[PDB]
Structure formats: structure tokens, C-alpha cells
Amino acid sequence: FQSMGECSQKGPVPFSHCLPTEKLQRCEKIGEGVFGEVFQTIADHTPVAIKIIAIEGPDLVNGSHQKTFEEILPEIIISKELSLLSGEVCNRTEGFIGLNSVHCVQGSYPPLLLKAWDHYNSTKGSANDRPDFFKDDQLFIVLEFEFGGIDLEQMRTKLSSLATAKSILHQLTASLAVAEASLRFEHRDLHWGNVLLKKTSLKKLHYTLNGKSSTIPSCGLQVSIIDYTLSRLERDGIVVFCDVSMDEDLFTGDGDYQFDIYRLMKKENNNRWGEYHPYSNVLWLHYLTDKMLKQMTFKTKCNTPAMKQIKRKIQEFHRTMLNFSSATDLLCQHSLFK
Ligand SMILES: Nc1ncnc2c1c(Cl)cn2[C@@H]1O[C@H](CO)[C@@H](O)[C@H]1O
Ligand SMILES: [Co+2]
Ligand code: NA
């Protein structure tokens, strides 16, 4: 059965099942990675994001081998578990992205998606191969997500002030804490492409951690965490994760603190990726705080002592947070969030 038993179709479906004519025609490419492609479209007046990953074939795609179904299952499972936290009671958060559906699709790549791919290449430039070489027996996983807004990297020059950065860090820490508490979750790849920002009219956002509800001032933005390709969690003691113990390349990057975080995770976990080490979530939050202070540039600087104090408190968070054991420890004990 398709979509984890929430679609009545059995066996692979064509692209047109997921992308009927008007939905396909409205696709625009919004992102990419070695994994594949991300398109935005609209259905029932509501934007969605469609992540398309080739699986099970022998061709290199963007320079790498395609995952098998067994290899892609963890991202599918984790996407669903994290989405479901929006509807839970004891441990509840909307800070992970909604998952609408997941399909296994068979076919060559739609010409209309190639048109969108071309437009992105012509305007932004792509690091990927044009995905025009797939045959009619090719399998894909198509994940349809809630549209989460714009990634923090693309918002480098677009945020109002460091007050907004504080909200963003609080939202991220709370979401991670709730997922720790519910699922013994580690994201493991929370670079600034994976933090999405969308406008909200809500003044406060709500979460529940181990039965205790609280709120976070939004500063007009709702944060969504995406991309569970490297993530880990467990349910009733059964662990789902990406075993990267034998990966060379993941640990040899340079030129950004991001690449150090991979090495620092490996140090923390002794290269045993099945274990639960929620300190990895602290390391990613440190990397994001570091981006907030060193790479983000804000429309309004910290011009008054009250704004300079927010800046100082974020600097203080940066210099103290590595002494906390988990996002839960940070949320519950760090002075930034009191
Ligand atoms: N649900 C989303 N809503 C909005 N943008 C999204 C997504 C996803 Cl998933 C990915 N992206 C974009 O694609 C890139 C590669 O994954 C990300 O960095 C986002 O820009
Ligand atoms: Co379906
Ligand atoms: Na969200």
C-alpha cells in the first residue's frame, strides 16, 4: 500500500498520481541536493513542497549511487514520526515539517519538472545533473511536505534583528527537546539549509514537553526543521538511523563549522551511530547560534542597550551551551529561555 497505508493504491504509481495536470503545471523548483530535487506547487489553494529521490537503480545520480528501498526507509519513517508530533499530547510540537504523503513512483522524469529544473538552472544555477536520463522502469520516492517557507541560509540578509534570531533558537531548541523526549531523536544534519522560516500571525507558539505546556514568542515567524536523511530515533526500543560509520567523505569536509560538527558527532558517539547521543542536537544548535552571530546580517542592528543585551545573551548562549547534555537540558535549564 502507498503512503504507509493511508493511500489505497498498491504497488508503484505514475508521477501523475502525485502530480495531476494542474499541480504538475504549477511546479517550480525550490531546492536541491545530492539526494535529488525539491519542487513547490499548489493544490487546494495551499502550497506544498515535493521532494523527489531516485531509488533502486544502478546509475549515478548527481555523482552518487542511488539508495535502495531499505536505505531510504529511515528518512520516510522519521519524517512521519516527526510530523505526527503536531497531534500528540504529552510531547507535542509543530516545529518539524508536516508530511502529507509518501509515494513510490515509477516512470521517466516528467517533462514539466524538467522545464522547472531548467528555469532554476538558468536563474540560480544547479550543482545537479539534469534528471532527464531515467527510463520508464525507474523508481522514485516522492515525499509531499507542508511548505515550510524559506531556509535560514537564503534568509541570511533578510531578518529583522537578533530578537528574531532568539525566537528562532528557542523554537529550534524546543522542537528538538520534544523529539528527544518522545522519540530519543537526533537530527544529525541541521545545517542552515534545513531550518525553514514562514510568516505567522500568531504572537506565541505552543509546545508540550513531558506533559508541561509552554509558549514561545514568535517574532512573526514559525520555524520548521526539515531533512531527516542522517537522523536517528527509536520507538519501544527499536532504533531507526543512518549508519555512517564506514563513510569517508562525511568527516573530511572543510571551510565551514558545519563540517566540524560531523567530526564532533563521531567523537561524541565513538562512531556508534545506533546509540542515543542527544549532545549531537546541542552541537547543531551551537553551529546555528554561530551562524546567527557570524554570518547572518540583520536589517536593524542592536542599537539600544536592551537590544545589546539580547545580543550579549545570545553570545552568552554561544559560549555556555556546549556544557549542556541535550536540547532538553538547554530548554529546561538555560537562562536564555527563562
Ligand atoms: N518542506 C519544504 N518547504 C520549503 N522548502 C523546502 C522544503 C523541503 Cl523538504 C526542502 N525545501 C528546500 O529545499 C532545500 C533542499 O532540501 C532546502 O534547503 C529548502 O530550501
Ligand atoms: Co496516493
Ligand atoms: Na512546522
- Sequential DSSP letters for 23-68: HHHT-EEEEEETTEEEEEEEETTEEEEEEEEEES-SS-BTTBPPBP
Placement of cell 517557507 in the chain:
149
Task: Please state, in angstroms and rounded to a whole number, the distance separating the CA atoms of residues 255 and 157.
Answer: 20
250 CB burial (10 A radius; 0-12, 13-18, 19+)? middle
Find the angle CA(124)-CA(115)-CA(134) to the nearest 5 degrees. 105
Q: Which three cell numbers stand for residue 179?
A: 523529539
Find the angle CA(209)-CA(215)-CA(221) to the nearest 5 degrees. 115
Give the resolution to one decimal, in Å: 1.5
- Which candidate in 118, 129, 189, 254 is catalytic? 189
CB distance 170 to 51 below 8 Å: no
Placement of cell 504523503 in the chain:
101
Task: Please state, in angstroms and rounded to a whole number, the distance separating the CA atoms of residues 262 and 251.
Answer: 6
Q: Is 189 annotated in the active site?
A: yes
190 is in an annotated binding site: yes
Task: Please state, in angstroms and rounded to a whole number, the distance separating the CA atoms of residues 129 and 121.
Answer: 10
Dihedral (CA of 187, 171, 154, 24) sign: positive
Three-state helix/strand/coil letters over 166-211: HHHHHHHHHHHHHHHHHHCCECCCCCHHHEEEEECCCCEEEEEECC
The 10 Å Cβ neighbour count of residue 143 is: 26
Contacts of 281 by beta carbon, 8 Å cutoff, 6+ apart: 176, 180, 185, 186, 187, 190, 326, 327
Residue 230 sits at φ, ψ, to 5 deg, of -110, 5
Task: Please state, in angstroms and rounded to a whole number, the distance separating the CA atoms of residues 189 and 127.
Answer: 19
Task: Please state, in angstroms and rounded to a whole number, the distance separating the CA atoms of residues 37 and 35.
Answer: 7
Contacts of 330 by beta carbon, 8 Å cutoff, 6+ apart: 173, 177, 282, 285, 321, 324, 337
Domain with 256 in it: 1-338
Contacts of 258 by beta carbon, 8 Å cutoff, 6+ apart: 191, 287
Q: Residue 104 CA: which ligand is closest?
A: 2
Residue 135 exposure: Cα atoms within 13 Å on the Cβ side: 5
Task: Please state, in angstroms and rounded to a whole number, the distance separating the CA atoms of residues 130 and 29.
Answer: 12
Q: Residue 28 CA: which ligand is closest?
A: 1
Q: How far is the CA of 301 from the centre of ligand 1 (A)?
A: 28
Q: Pick the residue whose CA is nearest to atom 18 on ligand 1.
A: 193
CB distance 314 to 165 below 8 Å: yes
Is 73 strand, coil or helix? Answer: helix
Dihedral (CA of 163, 168, 173, 174) sign: positive
Closest CA to 327 of 262, 293, 267, 280: 280
Number of domains in the chain: 1
CB distance 302 to 293 below 8 Å: no
CB distance 101 to 144 below 8 Å: yes
Antiparallel, parallel or unpaired: β 212-217 and 46-55:
unpaired
CB distance 177 to 209 below 8 Å: yes
Q: How far is the CA of 272 from the centre of ligand 1 (A)?
A: 29
Query: In 219-338, where do the E strands start and end?
Result: 221-225, 233-235, 238-240
Q: Candidates 29, 38, 83, 191: which one to mutate for ligand 1, based on the most atoms within 8 Å of Cβ?
A: 38
Task: Please state, in angstroms and rounded to a whole number, the distance separating the CA atoms of residues 281 and 172.
Answer: 10
Q: Kindly give the number of the ligand 1 atom that is closest to the alpha carbon of 153.
A: 18
Amino acid at 142: V
User: b vs e for 64-89, b when ≥16 Cβ sit within 10 Å of the residue's Cβ?
Assistant: eebbeeeebebbbbbbbbbbebeeee
> DSSP letters of 74-102?
HHHHHHHHHHHGGG-SSSB---B--EEEE
